[PDB]
Amino acid sequence: RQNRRPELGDKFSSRHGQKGVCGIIVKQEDMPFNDQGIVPDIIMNPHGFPSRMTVGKMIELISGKAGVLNGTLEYGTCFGGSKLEDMSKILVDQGFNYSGKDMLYSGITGECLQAYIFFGPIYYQKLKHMVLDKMHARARGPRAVLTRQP
Amino acid sequence: NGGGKVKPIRGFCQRLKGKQGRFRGNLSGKRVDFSGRTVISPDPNLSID
Amino acid sequence: KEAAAELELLNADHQHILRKLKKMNNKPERFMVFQLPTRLPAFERPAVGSIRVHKSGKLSVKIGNVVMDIGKGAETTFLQDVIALSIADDASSAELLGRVDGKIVVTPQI
Amino acid sequence: VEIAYHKCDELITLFNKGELETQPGCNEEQTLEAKIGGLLSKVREEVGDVCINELDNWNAPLIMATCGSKGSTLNVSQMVAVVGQQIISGNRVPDGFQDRSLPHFPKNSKTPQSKGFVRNSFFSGLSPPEFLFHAISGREGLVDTA
Amino acid sequence: MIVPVRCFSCGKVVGDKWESYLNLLQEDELDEGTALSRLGLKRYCCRRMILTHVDLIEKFLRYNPLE
Amino acid sequence: IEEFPLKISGEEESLHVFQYANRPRLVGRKPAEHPFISAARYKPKSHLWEIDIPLDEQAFYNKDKAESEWNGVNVQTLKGVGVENNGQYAAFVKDMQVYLVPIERVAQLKPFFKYIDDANVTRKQENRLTGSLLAHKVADEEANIELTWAEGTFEQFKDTIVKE
Amino acid sequence: LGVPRIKEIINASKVISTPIINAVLVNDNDERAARVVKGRVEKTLLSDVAFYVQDVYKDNLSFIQVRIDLGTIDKLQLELTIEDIAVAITRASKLKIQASDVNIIGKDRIAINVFPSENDVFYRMQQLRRALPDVVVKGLPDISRAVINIRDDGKRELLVEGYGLRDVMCTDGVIGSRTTTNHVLEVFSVLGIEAARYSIIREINYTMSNHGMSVDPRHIQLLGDVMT
Amino acid sequence: DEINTAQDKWHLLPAFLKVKGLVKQHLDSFNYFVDTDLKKIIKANQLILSDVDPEFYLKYVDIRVGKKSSSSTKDYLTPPHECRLRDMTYSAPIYVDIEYTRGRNIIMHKDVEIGRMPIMLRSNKCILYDADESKMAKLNECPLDPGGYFIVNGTEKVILVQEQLSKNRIIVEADEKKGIVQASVTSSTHERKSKTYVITKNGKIYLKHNSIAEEIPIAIVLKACGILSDLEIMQLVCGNDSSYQDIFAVNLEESSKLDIYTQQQALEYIGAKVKTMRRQKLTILQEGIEAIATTVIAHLTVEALDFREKALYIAMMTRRVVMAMYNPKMIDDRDYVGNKRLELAGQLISLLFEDLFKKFNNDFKLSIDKVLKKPNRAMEYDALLSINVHSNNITSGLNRAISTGNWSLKRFKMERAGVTHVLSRLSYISALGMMTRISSQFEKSRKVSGPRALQPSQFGMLCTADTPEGEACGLVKNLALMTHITTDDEEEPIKKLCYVLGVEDITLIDSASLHLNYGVYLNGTLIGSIRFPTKFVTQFRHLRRTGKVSEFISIYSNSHQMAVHIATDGGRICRPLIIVSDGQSRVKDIHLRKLLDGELDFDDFLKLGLVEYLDVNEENDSYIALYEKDIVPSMTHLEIEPFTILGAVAGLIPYPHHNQSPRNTYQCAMGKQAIGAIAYNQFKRIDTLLYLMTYPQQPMVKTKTIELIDYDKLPAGQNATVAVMSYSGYDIEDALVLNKSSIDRGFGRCETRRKTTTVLKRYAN
Amino acid sequence: MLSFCPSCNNMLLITSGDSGVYTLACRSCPYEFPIEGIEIYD
Ligand SMILES: [Zn+2]
Ligand SMILES: [Zn+2]
């Protein structure tokens, strides 16, 4: 056995069809925080949503932040699920924007981020294709008897 | 013999011939040395080239 | 629309079988042939039923346990001209009888 | 969308019990086929026009797709405004069944939403009949590549 | 497995309150959201792990050596 | 809501019934134009009844064909296999009542030619057996009977009368 | 227009799907001479000309007797009266039938008497009744169909499916100095070489500007070159 | 608390799945096998007898697995999980009972092992079967592993549900050139055999059957088929008027130019062109030379004794090709599921069995000859323990098949491979992911795009959300959540019943049919063409939904093509849903309180006449609505829930109706690669390469599909609090950016487990 | 001409006739034909 720390270069998914690999691993201090003090854990590139045109996830985020406040697993399902328009009501009284967006402070500078940002809980499952398996190198190795080429 | 009906008795003309065989996939397609294979990841800070 | 015309052809039959039926009231040699479900579903074999066309051209046909068993129309024979025969005591057979005119089935309703 | 339902509805309802003007499509019944395909395309694009134009300033399916890089105005039109005419093999979805597409439709329905059409945005959700359709077009593309 | 000993963002220690959480739910039947709140987690990423995190370790202790 | 009576029949030497491909209903006033002469046969198990009707010389007959090889001035050759299946019943309407009768074996009737058997007469000279062939060869072996033919109404009224 | 078209142009085989012939018309009309030449070459009209077919026997008489609608020749303008199509029958008959007398009494009649493994009168009779309402009457036998088209707004001129490019080039009432097509190989058999090449890099560049990108003419001219 | 008629139907799907399980396909077919088809196979061959010593016989009587008549379940067997560590093969022994001929006054019997059968986890005969959470402990094994996978040689494998083209059915294909091949390939028991038919040339059309030499004019055969009237052929296969008149008669010509009269010689044209009987048996060169073939050529579908059935069957087939020659379209593609019948492990392992058992008998004969060749004393000798020494070919041979995937069937001379797999455990989802996977096979070459795309008929009876890229030589699909693969039912009763309703036997029929009504096809075989088709239908369907012949035996009318079909075939896809009588459903909303109480459950609505199983054919004839909210009293049925359409894998995705489908396809191609908690027995089992995660968590938003696969008790993933922003500049396409001091706090940590087996073995020295 | 055999019920065909005239028989079962044939089809 060995316990792999999720090293740079490890495929993650959004369970929603986003299939990606981590980039720089930033420290803690960096990346936004806002008012509670929380630090977004995974931080994700926006561009993927429009060209892949998948808004399901981008609702799942709302449903998530709404869930963890009421303290209830909140449902969703094909042709059905929790009706979005009430999700707002659950947040707006508890202080978070009627849509998922919220302010954040860039960790680097420390001044307000000039545009709103949108975040909540999302379920990111980690995949096979751990890199420490898949990296490969050779100097001069064995050759097959027949062709005597690597 | 055997006689459990073993089809690919052909040993020769084909090893020289087709698909990924000798002549193409092996001699013109030679598998190489001093190499490496890895997953990628962006690096803006690094220059081009 | 399908059923309307379909179910109408029922009463169209009650007319059809009705006329040529009562035209058999005489005693020539003319035979109409039926089909009945097997197992003889009436009541028992103690040792039968009868027919009616109820008002507005129905069919009430009963056998046993006053079972309501009704079927009408038929498959259309036409080109086949059908003749009823008899086996007379093995050899010296073949007494021909009544030919055929009418044909109708019967089915337990549901 | 409703402006098209009665327009093409008028075309199909007068084709069955009467005749019409058949464009140079050689035989007929493809007349209303090219009609419905053109009309629904122009409607779908037109709703995207008021989707991109009257959309607010400073929002990402605009600043990105309207201008720079990922996606395009048709793409964001499929998100907010409407999706339309899942089109496989060049036209609407052919009959797998008899005189119908799916079990959920009556017989001899030439209306849209009966073949590979959707009136709902990805945002408003989908109905099963249009979902199964939208599970086709993108797939015929996938095999068409593979 | 076991409730983590801090969340994955804040760093407030959640290791403790999982016991007091579940106890506070079973005895003194009380709804989730209200429960965790007076249990002292206002920030939600601190909170998820209490709320989330099925506890497997029980279902893994059926299989122990002695039985 | 009235009643029209019906009652069963007995065995009464069975029954049977032909239908044949030859002669449909006439288009004219009386569509019937009944067959003739009978002169038939039977054999057990497989029945295969030879059925016979003579031919007219005025019919555009061509005695030459009959005088060519096979002699056709003889009767017309009809036969076919047959089957019984239950529930199939004849009936007749006697006055206000009606009498059903069982049928049993029903045969189609197919015209064919012993004439090509004559085509064989000049053609021939100068374990296992499980299936329909097991039935064909047996059908050939045991094939043999001369059946008379009769017509009339005797018990078909009265047997039905006495058995109600 | 797909990439498999490049497959066939590069591959340069004998037979090809949708082998269009582009042929510019003499002048610009949608009427008459417009349609006329289309009537001068389109497949065979015989069944469309066939009206109904007729067979009768009088004693020994064996008749294949049919009639025709002249008003159709008035619809689509063609050059025939009867004896044109009359001799045309025995012309094309070489596929099956044999040459003999044929006649009209008036207004579109044919007369075919046939005669002598017996019942030959009946057997040939059948095949005659069968394939006759097919065979070529007027047209160019390798051409399936033709369409008159509209160019821009002003010009309107036909394109024709078929392999000929020689006959239809020759065919009266179409200026031949400009006629254009696909399937390079058959260009190579009429104009040939330098023409075939200069076509292949026109058509490659054509089809591959529809699917997008741009390859420049530089490379294409080279492809069509080493192919030629 | 009145339950809302809108969603209350939700409570169905669990109760459906609760008793009758999620993965029941592989179970039932198995449990049907061991409990039944063994008692068939031996009932086929119960007597082996040599040629020698005219007094001998060996008479099988009963077959049993694990039950020697001591207790109900076998008194002792080896526990499966522990059997997985030793590289053993989970097995229950076979038991057979025999009759001998040995010496004067014997004819004795016993209870004997012929060998061992690798039964299937959580079958009937398994130790795990019906054991709750306690035996689970003591047997050291997972509660939530759905089972239905075998285990052999210590590895862990599955028979994969194998799709197969419809067998014993009509099909009509057209093409450029060609001339519209028709085909009917029929098989049962002996001799799986194809029969093609087509035009050769120009209205002149012929039977190609490789048993015959080359071809026959169909007019000849149909004559020899025992309809001799000739020109009534035209009236039969053609029609009355339409166009069809001419097109067929052209064919009918060339029969006249040759020969006629099946009474002797018209048959003789056939046997004249048949190949030889291979020496002996040729004795049947006759006019009955080919009378064998005319009932058994290909078709074992009819055969029998007189000809009229097969005759008119081949006729009605010949109709559909000339219908195609009239116009293209109006024909049958092979795409929509109703023309394809998948098949489970049940019939597979038998077919393999009766072969291995058959070779067991053929050779056990030849071993009982050696003893009885050379007389010694009066040769008696038990002639019974020799089954032990001459066995395994039944067992070890069977293990070879089930593990490797080479099935060599000598009896069909038909070989298939790649038919099983290592069940891949990377996740609890993959556990039932390999399970319930449809492997299509054959597919000729790849170049046809036809047997590829996703046909709209597939709605709800197969997962729409995955068709991954492991295609290659085949195709892979998945079932829906609610499917019940119909088994074999029966025939003769439904036949005589059909008559009871008043259909008329073909023998009585006019010999003018096509005009009158439609015709009633059992399994694609003509019977009655009854009067009043629709009333017949509603009557029959009314019977099925309550009284008799339930589940399958579907029925559907047809219009364009004139037919009504009663299909009894097994190995076929069916699905649940509710009948709406008049406007509303049959539920009546008080029935569900009467349900969730637990005194009612499922498979009770059939006997109450609420829900039944349709079929792709039937439902195509039927009319369905989505929501109870929208009904019109033109309707028949309403789906119980719309989200049954997404597969067990697909049900994961939250809010799938907001995506574009290729994303869900890639997702059903991913989630089975999500590392996870596997099963509760995780740490105790020892596997080849097994990942697993340190701190799994319930996905924050579930789906009513997840909770019913127990996916939240084995969650695979972390639940990560995640901005959406451009940061760094290390981001770009799909590339995430993680968080130190978070990843270090126990986010997304993995383990990995490998096994190294080293077998120690003694050498002949 | 493709017509029906009365009686014999097989087929019809035009045949080569004696003294010409072709008559019209039913091959392989006795029949003959009046000629003077009125034959009309479209
Ligand atoms: Zn926190
Ligand atoms: Zn005749």
CA of A38 to the centre of ligand 1 (A): 6
CATH of the domain at D11: 1.10.132.30
Residues of chain C found within 8 Å of residue H516, distances taken between Cβ atoms: 75-76
| Whole-number CA gyration radius for chain D | 17
Interface test with H, best of D27, D86, D97 (most H CBs within 10 A): D97
Rounded Cα–Cα distance for residues E22 and E14 (Å): 13
Determine the distance in angstroms separating the CA of H544 from the nearest CA of chain C, rounded to an integer. Answer: 12
Closest alpha carbon to H655 in B28, I20, A64, E45: A64
Q: Which long-range contacts (CB under 8 A, 24 or more apart) does H188-191 make?
A: H188/H300, H189/H300, H190/H300, H190/H411, H191/H300
CA atoms within 13 A on the CB side of C75: 26
**Helix segments in H642-761, DSSP class H:** 661-668, 706-709
Q: Residues of E marked as binding for Zn(2+)?
A: 7, 10, 45-46
* H719 strand-pairing partners: A123
For H697, the closest of E6, E9, E53 (CB atoms) is E53
Residues of chain C found within 8 Å of residue H502, distances taken between Cβ atoms: 35, 37, 71, 105-107
Does I5 count as an annotated binding residue? yes
CA atoms within 13 A on the CB side of H522: 21
Domain assignment of residue D139, yes or no = no
Q: What is the DSSP string of chain F?
A: ---EEEE----SS---EEEESS----SSSS-------------SSS----EEE---TTTT--HHHHHHSS--SS-EEEE--EE--TTEEEEEEETTEEEEEE---EEEEEE--THHHHHHHHHH------SHHHHHHHHHHT-------EE--SHHHHHHHHT-
Region of residue E40 (left: phi > 0; alpha: psi -120 to 50; beta: else): left
Closest alpha carbon to A43 in A99, A107, A86, A94: A107
C-alpha distances out from residue D30 to D14, D20, D44, H16, Å: 14, 12, 21, 46
Rounded Cα–Cα distance for residues A74 and A82 (Å): 7
Residues H216, H200 contacting (CB under 8 angstroms): no
* H155 strand-pairing partners: H152
CA of G94 to the centre of ligand 2 (A): 36
Does I12 count as an annotated binding residue? no
Range of the domain at I42: 1-42
* All partners of chain A with 3 or more CB pairs under 8 angstroms: B, D, E, H
Q: Say whether H408 sits in a helix, a strand or coil.
A: strand
Note the residue count of chain A.
150
Residues G38, G148 contacting (CB under 8 angstroms): yes
Rounded Cα–Cα distance for residues H284 and H298 (Å): 19
Instruction: Tell me how far apart the terminal alpha carbons of chain B are, to the nearest angstrom.
Output: 60
Does I38 count as an annotated binding residue? no
Strand H150-152 to A76-77 pairing: unpaired
* H182 strand-pairing partners: H172, H197
Residues H613, H485 contacting (CB under 8 angstroms): no
CA of I10 to the centre of ligand 2 (A): 6
Residue with tokens 């299936």: F131
| CB-based contact A136 B30, cutoff 8 Å | no
Residues 6+ apart with CB under 8 A from F78: F20, F22, F50, F51, F52, F53, F109, F110, F111, F112
CA of H693 to the centre of ligand 1 (A): 21
Residues of chain F found within 8 Å of residue I33, distances taken between Cβ atoms: 60
Strand order in the sheet with A43-44: A43-44, H718-724, A120-124
C-alpha distances out from residue I18 to G114, H258, H352, H440, I22, Å: 17, 22, 69, 67, 7
Rounded Cα–Cα distance for residues A18 and A56 (Å): 12
Residues A127, B22 contacting (CB under 8 angstroms): no
Rounded Cα–Cα distance for residues H70 and H63 (Å): 15
Determine the distance in angstroms separating the CA of G141 from the nearest CA of chain I, rounded to an integer. Answer: 27
| CB-based contact C80 H510, cutoff 8 Å | yes
CATH of E1-66, one of 3.30.70.260, 1.10.10.60, 1.10.760.10, 3.40.1260.10: 1.10.10.60
* H619 in contact with D, Cβ within 8 Å: yes
Residues D138, H465 contacting (CB under 8 angstroms): no
Closest alpha carbon to G159 in G141, G185, G184, G178: G178
Determine the distance in angstroms separating the CA of D79 from the nearest CA of chain A, rounded to an integer. Answer: 7
CA of B48 to the centre of ligand 2 (A): 95
- Write out the H or E segment, with its range, that includes residue H335: none
Range of the domain at C94: 1-110
For I16, the closest of G53, G59, G118 (CB atoms) is G118
Rounded Cα–Cα distance for residues H129 and H66 (Å): 14
Residues G98, G158 contacting (CB under 8 angstroms): no
Residue with tokens 């969308």: D1
Rounded Cα–Cα distance for residues H609 and I19 (Å): 78
| CB-based contact F111 I32, cutoff 8 Å | no
Rounded Cα–Cα distance for residues H527 and H509 (Å): 9
Determine the distance in angstroms separating the CA of B41 from the nearest CA of chain H, rounded to an integer. Answer: 7
- Write out the H or E segment, with its range, that includes residue H443: none
Question: Which structure tokens are listed for G71?
Answer: 């008003």
For H250, the closest of G119, G123, G130 (CB atoms) is G130
CA of F112 to the centre of ligand 2 (A): 11
Residues H656, H595 contacting (CB under 8 angstroms): no
| CB-based contact I31 F116, cutoff 8 Å | no
CA of H736 to the centre of ligand 1 (A): 21
Rounded Cα–Cα distance for residues A103 and A139 (Å): 52
Q: Which long-range contacts (CB under 8 A, 24 or more apart) does I19-24 make?
A: I20/G59, I20/G60, I21/G59, I21/G60, I22/G57, I22/G59, I22/G60, I22/G121
- Write out the H or E segment, with its range, that includes residue C29: none
Rounded Cα–Cα distance for residues G99 and G96 (Å): 10
Domain assignment of residue D145, yes or no = no
Counting CB pairs under 8 A, whether chains H and I reach 3 or more, is yes
| CB-based contact A79 D78, cutoff 8 Å | no
Nearest ligand to the C-alpha of residue A68?
1
Residues of chain H found within 8 Å of residue I10, distances taken between Cβ atoms: 229-231, 260
Compute the C-alpha angle H680/H682/H684, nearest 5°.
110
Q: What is the DSSP string of F85-102?
A: -TTEEEEEEETTEEEEEE
Closest chain I CA to residue H257: I27
Rounded Cα–Cα distance for residues D69 and D142 (Å): 23
Amino acid, res. H478:
N
Number of CB atoms found within 10 A of residue H83's CB: 18
For D128, the closest of A47, A50, A79 (CB atoms) is A79
Strand F88-94 to G20-23 pairing: unpaired
CA H631 to chain centre: 35
Amino acid, res. H62:
D
Question: Which structure tokens are listed for F153?
Answer: 């109404």
Rounded Cα–Cα distance for residues H461 and H470 (Å): 22
C-alpha distances out from residue D134 to A131, D88, H722, H736, Å: 35, 10, 29, 29
Domain count, chain I: 1
Number of CB atoms found within 10 A of residue H30's CB: 25
Rounded Cα–Cα distance for residues H96 and H69 (Å): 12
Determine the distance in angstroms separating the CA of H250 from the nearest CA of chain G, rounded to an integer. Answer: 9
Residues C103, C97 contacting (CB under 8 angstroms): no
H570, burial (CB in 10 Å: exposed 0-12, middle 13-18, buried 19+): middle
Maximum distance among all alpha carbons in chain F? 76
Determine the distance in angstroms separating the CA of D42 from the nearest CA of chain A, rounded to an integer. Answer: 21
Q: Residues of E marked as binding?
A: 7, 10, 45-46
Q: What is the DSSP string of H581-629?
A: -SSS-S-TTTTTHHHHTTTS-SS-HHHHTSEEEEEHHHHHHS-EES-TT
Question: Which structure tokens are listed for G159?
Answer: 């394109």
Q: What is the DSSP string of G113-142?
A: -------HHHHHHHHHHHHTTTS-SSS-TT
Rounded Cα–Cα distance for residues H576 and A3 (Å): 46
Domain count, chain C: 1
Residues 6+ apart with CB under 8 A from H254: H204, H217, H219
Strand H564-566 to H520-522 pairing: parallel
* H731 in contact with B, Cβ within 8 Å: yes
* D61 in contact with A, Cβ within 8 Å: yes
Counting CB pairs under 8 A, whether chains C and H reach 3 or more, is yes
Resolution in A: 4.1
Residues H10, A78 contacting (CB under 8 angstroms): no
Compute the C-alpha angle H758/H761/H765, nearest 5°.
150
Domain count, chain D: 1
Residues 6+ apart with CB under 8 A from D138: H660, H661, H662
Question: Which structure tokens are listed for H245?
Answer: 């008149």
Residues F100, F8 contacting (CB under 8 angstroms): yes
| CB-based contact F62 I34, cutoff 8 Å | no
D67, burial (CB in 10 Å: exposed 0-12, middle 13-18, buried 19+): exposed
| CB-based contact G57 I20, cutoff 8 Å | no
Rounded Cα–Cα distance for residues H116 and H93 (Å): 4
CA of A39 to the centre of ligand 1 (A): 8
Determine the distance in angstroms separating the CA of F37 from the nearest CA of chain I, rounded to an integer. Answer: 15
* CA quadruple A35, A41, A46, A52: dihedral, nearest 10: -140
Compute the C-alpha angle A65/A71/A74, nearest 5°.
60
Put simply, the chain C residues between 4 and 33 with a CB less than 8 A from any chain F CB are 21-22, 24-27, 29-33
